[PDB]
Design an enzyme around this catalytic site. Structure first.
Site: not given
Ligand SMILES: C[C@@H](NC(=O)c1c[nH]c2ncc(C3CC3)nc12)C(C)(C)O
Length: 278
Positions: A18, A130
């Site tokens: 990611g 996040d």
């Protein structure tokens, strides 16, 4: 050490991907006999100036972070970031697997711990950007830690919000409306996302009632639709068997204007109380 030599870090497996980076399980094995401790090691896979510099800032953010509720910085190698390894994995999977063991009290313990870690991050002027059960790690049965500071920004002393130029690349259902509309991120948008983490906790990250699945049920670009729904005051429903007082906490975090959401420092005591009465 706080400086690790690469020749001593032995690859074992991939932990995740990611944000143009990867986290690997490595053994730090200076003796080369498989007796060294295990560590998680983050490295970029791209040599471009913008992401190298980003990754450097990530290392400095985490290095300066000291909290029982934040994944521990261990050091660097030269390029790579060395962290503590938590074999229990992310809370998202942990909740799915241990569903039948974890009662409401336990979920509230996890909730209070994430809140405490976010309050601390707040005090450092750090926006996580996040927050999501996938980025929370399990230290033990009764201990969680926030992780993945790949998108975390430090707020300048004169501002309390951050504006990102390029669009977000995370699942849209954890974003605050002002993030969706204007790419505004702040500690208060983290509060929004924490509302979604609460939802994840009380649905034990069950896929069928995920934020994703619930939006499709409520039903033009998906992002616009999501903004519309939230604009009308549509919200995620009380997770099945959710205590009412917990659902109300979620809805408070999901207040349309950022300045109407509770602070983490206000959220904390409430969670601790609910936990003491469960
Ligand atoms: C948050 C990220 N994880 C990390 O940064 C981690 C740092 N120490 C860890 N120990 C175990 C895990 C297991 C879940 C694999 N992830 C991490 C990532 C997105 C890769 O899980």
């Amino acid at each position: 050490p706080t400086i690790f030599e690469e020749r001593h870090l032995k690859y074992i497996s991939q932990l995740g991907k990611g944000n143009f980076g990867s986290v690997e399980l490595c053994r730090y094995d200076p003796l080369g006999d498989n007796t060294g401790a295990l560590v998680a090691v983050k490295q970029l896979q791209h040599s471009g100036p913008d992401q190298q510099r980003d990754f450097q800032r990530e290392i400095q953010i985490l290095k300066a972070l000291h909290s029982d509720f934040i994944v521990k910085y261990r050091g660097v190698s030269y390029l790579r970031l060395v962290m503590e390894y938590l074999p229990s994995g992310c809370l998202r999977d942990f909740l799915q697997r241990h569903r039948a063991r974890l009662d409401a009290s336990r979920l509230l313990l996890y909730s209070s711990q994430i809140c405490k870690g976010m309050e601390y991050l707040g005090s450092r002027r750090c926006v996580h950007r996040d927050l999501a059960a996938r980025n929370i790690l399990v230290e033990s049965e009764a201990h969680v830690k926030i992780a993945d500071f790949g998108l975390a920004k430090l707020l300048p002393l004169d501002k309390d919000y951050y504006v990102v130029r390029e669009p977000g690349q995370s699942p849209i259902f954890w974003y605050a409306p002002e993030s969706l509309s204007d790419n505004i991120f702040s500690r208060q948008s983290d509060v929004w996302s924490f509302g979604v983490v609460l939802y994840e906790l009380f649905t034990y990250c069950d896929k069928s009632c995920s934020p994703s699945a619930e939006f499709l049920r409520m039903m033009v670009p998906a992002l616009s639709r999501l903004l519309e729904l939230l604009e009308e005051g549509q919200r995620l429903p009380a997770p099945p068997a959710c205590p009412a007082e917990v659902h109300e906490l979620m809805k408070l975090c999901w207040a349309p204007s950022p300045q109407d959401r509770p602070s983490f420092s206000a959220l904390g005591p409430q969670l601790d109380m609910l936990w003491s009465g469960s």
